[PDB]
Structure formats: C-alpha cells, structure tokens
Design an enzyme around this catalytic site. Sequence first.
Site, short mmCIF file in Angstrom:
data_model
loop_
_atom_site.label_atom_id
_atom_site.label_comp_id
_atom_site.label_asym_id
_atom_site.label_seq_id
_atom_site.Cartn_x
_atom_site.Cartn_y
_atom_site.Cartn_z
N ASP A 159 8.31 -19.71 -5.88
CA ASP A 159 8.17 -18.58 -6.77
C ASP A 159 9.51 -17.83 -6.82
O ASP A 159 9.58 -16.59 -6.58
CB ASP A 159 7.02 -17.72 -6.24
CG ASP A 159 6.44 -16.75 -7.28
OD1 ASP A 159 6.69 -16.87 -8.51
OD2 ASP A 159 5.72 -15.84 -6.85
N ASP A 191 -2.36 -22.66 -1.21
CA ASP A 191 -3.65 -23.16 -1.72
C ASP A 191 -4.56 -22.02 -2.24
O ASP A 191 -4.98 -22.07 -3.40
CB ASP A 191 -4.34 -24.00 -0.64
CG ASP A 191 -3.75 -25.39 -0.49
OD1 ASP A 191 -3.06 -25.88 -1.42
OD2 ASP A 191 -3.99 -26.02 0.56
#
Length: 280
Positions: free
Chosen positions: A133, A160
């Site tokens: 990110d 996840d």
Amino acid sequence: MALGELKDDDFEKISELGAGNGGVVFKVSHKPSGLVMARKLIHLEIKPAIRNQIIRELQVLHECNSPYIVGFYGAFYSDGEISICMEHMDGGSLDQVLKKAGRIPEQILGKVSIAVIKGLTYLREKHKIMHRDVKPSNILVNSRGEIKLCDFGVSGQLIDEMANEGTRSYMSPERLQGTHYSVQSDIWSMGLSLVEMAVGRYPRPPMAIFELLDYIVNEPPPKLPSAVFSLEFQDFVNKCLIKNPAERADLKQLMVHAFIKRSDAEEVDFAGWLCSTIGL
Ligand SMILES: Nc1ncnc2c1ncn2[C@@H]1O[C@H](COP(=O)(O)OP(=O)(O)OP(=O)(O)O)[C@@H](O)[C@H]1O
Ligand SMILES: O=C(NOC[C@@H](O)CO)c1ccc(F)c(F)c1Nc1ccc(I)cc1F
Ligand SMILES: [Mg+2]
C-alpha cells in the site's frame, strides 16, 4: 520488555491525526512512560483466535529498525479494536502535505524517492516484507526533515482480514488483473505517488471507478508534463510505471538512477521547506 503490556487506560488522547478507509489515528500520551505516540485503532469483527494471530504477527515490527520506517511501540486488542501504537510523525503524510503545498517540487520528491527506495530495500532484504500500500498517505514526515513509511504488510493475517473488509486506484495493471502481489507493484505505486505529488492531483482523467480500473489495465501509464520537470525525473517515474512488471525498473536499478544520484548530492532543506508550508 521495553514497554510491557500496553492497555487503553494508560493512554491520554492529545489530538486526532486524521482518519481513512477503516480507522482513526490519534496523537496520544502513554502516561506511564512519557512516550508521545501515534495510536491507530482498527475495527475488525473477527473470531478471537484470528485476532491474536494478528497482534502476534504485529510483534515482528519490534524488529523493524530503519531511519526510513516509522517506529513501532506496541499492538494490543481492546473492545473490538486493534491498536497499533507507533512513532508520531509531526509532519503527517505527504497526502496532507500535498493538500497544503498544492504541488511538491521535484527536488523534495527526489529526497522522498531516496527515502522510499531505501525503506523498501530495507523491508525486502531484512524482513522479506513487501509494502502492499505505497501511496502518499503512508509516506510520513517530521520537523526533523525525516521521511518514513508506515502501513506495510508485516502481518499475513491482517493482509487477509483487510482484503475482505482497498486503494485499487493505486494498484498496478498486473495486480488489477488479479496477479499475486510482487515488489514490482510497490514500484508502480511508488511511480504513481511521485507523479500525483508532482502534478498536484491523482494523475488520470476523471471517470467512474470500474472504468478507471480497466482504464489502468488497458491504457498506457501516466507521465509527467515534459515542460516543467527534468528529463531524469521523467525517466525515473517512467521506469517505475512500465506496464509489464518484467520490464519495470527494480529497486537495485532505481537506486543508481540519474535522478537518485542527482538528488542524493543536492542540499535540500526539506525540514524548513516543510515547516514553512504546513505552518509547523
Ligand atoms: N504515525 C503517524 N503519525 C502522524 N500521523 C499519522 C500516523 N499514522 C497515520 N497518520 C495520519 O492519520 C491518517 C490516517 O491514516 P490511515 O492509515 O488511518 O488512513 P490513510 O492511509 O490516510 O487512508 P486509507 O485508510 O484510505 O489507506 C493519515 O492521513 C495520516 O495523516
Ligand atoms: O494500518 C494499515 N493499513 O491501514 C489502512 C486503513 O484502511 C486502516 O488504517 C496496515 C495494513 C496492513 C498491515 F500489516 C499493517 F501492519 C498495517 N498497519 C501498520 C503497519 C506498520 C506500521 I510502523 C504501522 C501500522 F499501523
Ligand atoms: Mg495509512
């Protein structure tokens, strides 16, 4: 150990450092130690088992030690939220900075390029962590002129649990087509960060989200205005944004690029630049 068991009662809220997709961040005083921290609360509704495996996976951040990585103090669960307590960067993110500046000049962004490349080389080589990110709100800055990354994917479980409760406008073409994450994807999101901060806006024609996502896969990458940016910066960003990940520059290669070597040598008073633009 250094801080011991961290608990919500120890913290007094000083201010709010902002919010994003699914979480709020406050500047806090850890009262027992006198430490000033950034406290980030994450709401996840998860079965206790899975939460504790997150908080434990998060302890690997105690081993993260780089002038280019935001520092970690601890991580606990209280009342449905996971808290990740971290070093407080007093300049905020480049995101908040760009709002105030309008555009960040090339020379300053060469200091960011170096800090970003070095931050990621650190993660890959020391910890086998990919960021996942990279984008300007996860690059943070302080009054000491320091530039650091946060919000990288140390925790498999959190990766996840995050994927199923992101910032798709920042994902490379191949990642968008559903490919497993790679370092070459950190690099695209790097490239794209550098162009957004340079030009002052998210560097794509406006459009609806699902249109944008195929736009990115199908259309050629963004580029700097050729008028107002050195050819070496345009090359640098171009090499980060090659759509084939096989042909995109890697970090080794970027670290010895004309634009990085040029910027390394320059004397930019980034801290005073900063303190000027955000009134610090
Ligand atoms: N360690 C820190 N020091 C100072 N400010 C911080 C710190 N961590 C986060 N922030 C601020 O809090 C904001 C919240 O970041 P968060 O990770 O909560 O969302 P984001 O990266 O802004 O966006 P998104 O959730 O959409 O990815 C950031 O914009 C940044 O300004
Ligand atoms: O917080 C993260 N993303 O936030 C986006 C937003 O929607 C919610 O805030 C995040 C995601 C995956 C992961 F593994 C992490 F460790 C994260 N947090 C995180 C990582 C390193 C530091 I030093 C400080 C941190 F806080
Ligand atoms: Mg963030």
